């Protein structure tokens, strides 16, 4: 089995937090190549893309800050 | 059945947009049936402006949460 | 040859842009064949709008997928 640290633990916590966000974005892109002017399609596109953007930014910032605490506390060993 | 906060906001707008989109067609076909009056043209114009302004409100109410949450992420450290 | 996660996203819309170029070129040609109707002018605005919408949507896709990980690589440390 692949390993997972606390950083990987929180990253996986976000990844399992969003159920089908990646697939939803991909299918929004796929349908946006066919019927783009559709309101119920284009609005959902932009909404879910913004949600995906914030999800990725939250993942990166959370893992970076947790690495920051880890580095700061580990610097105090010596 | 996922619907995040941005999707939650869009939910309050999709049901309004659908009604306007269904009634603008009912205005257009009526106008095509009897275009001899200007009152029906004004009604169709008002319905179209209704649809487009509500759509624009939906368009802007999402980019205004975009930067709020982005600024939260910037100070999220 | 090589194609990253942005090249394929751009090419996803390329299947419709070529179609719409062909269609708009035929629209101009048939307008030149006979211009005495507003139906063709209306179709012209219907099609140029779809063109601008495809192009702007593709630009938005590539921009947002640039910014999705520009920030992640900014704090890549």
């Amino acid at each position: 089995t692949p390993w997972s640290g606390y950083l990987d633990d929180v990253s996986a916590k976000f990844d399992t937090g969003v159920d089908n966000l990646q697939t939803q974005v991909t299918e929004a892109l796929d349908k946006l190549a066919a019927k783009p002017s559709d309101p119920a399609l284009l609005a959902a596109y932009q909404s879910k893309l913004s949600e995906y953007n914030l999800y990725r930014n939250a993942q990166s910032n959370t893992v970076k800050v947790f690495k920051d605490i880890d580095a700061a506390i580990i610097q105090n060993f010596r | 059945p996922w619907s995040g906060y941005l999707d939650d906001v869009s939910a309050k707008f999709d049901t309004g947009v659908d009604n306007l989109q269904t009634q603008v067609t009912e205005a257009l076909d009526k106008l095509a049936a009897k275009p001899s009056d200007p009152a029906l043209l004004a009604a169709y114009q008002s319905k179209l402006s209704e649809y487009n302004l509500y759509r624009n409100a939906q368009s802007n109410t999402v980019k205004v949460f975009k930067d709020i949450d982005a600024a939260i992420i910037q100070n999220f450290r | 040859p090589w194609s990253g996660y942005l090249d394929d996203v751009s090419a996803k819309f390329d299947t419709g842009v070529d179609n719409l170029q062909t269609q708009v070129t035929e629209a101009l040609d048939k307008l030149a064949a006979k211009p005495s109707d507003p139906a063709l002018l209306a179709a012209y605005q219907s099609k140029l709008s779809e063109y601008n919408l495809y192009r702007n949507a593709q630009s938005n896709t590539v921009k947002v997928f640039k910014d999705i990980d520009a920030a992640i690589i900014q704090n890549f440390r």
């Binding site: 019927k35 002017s37 559709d38 309101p39 119920a40 399609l41 | 659908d18 989109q21 269904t22 603008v24 067609t25 257009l28 076909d29 106008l31 095509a32 275009p35 | 109707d37 507003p38 139906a39 209306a42 179709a43 219907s46 709008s49 779809e50």
Partner: peptide
């Protein structure tokens, strides 16, 4: 329920009254 078809109906009804 989409917008390409409403553009199509506009481009069609602008001619449906021409003749």
């Amino acid at each position: 329920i989409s917008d390409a078809e409403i553009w199509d109906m506009v481009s069609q009804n602008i001619s449906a009254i021409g003749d």
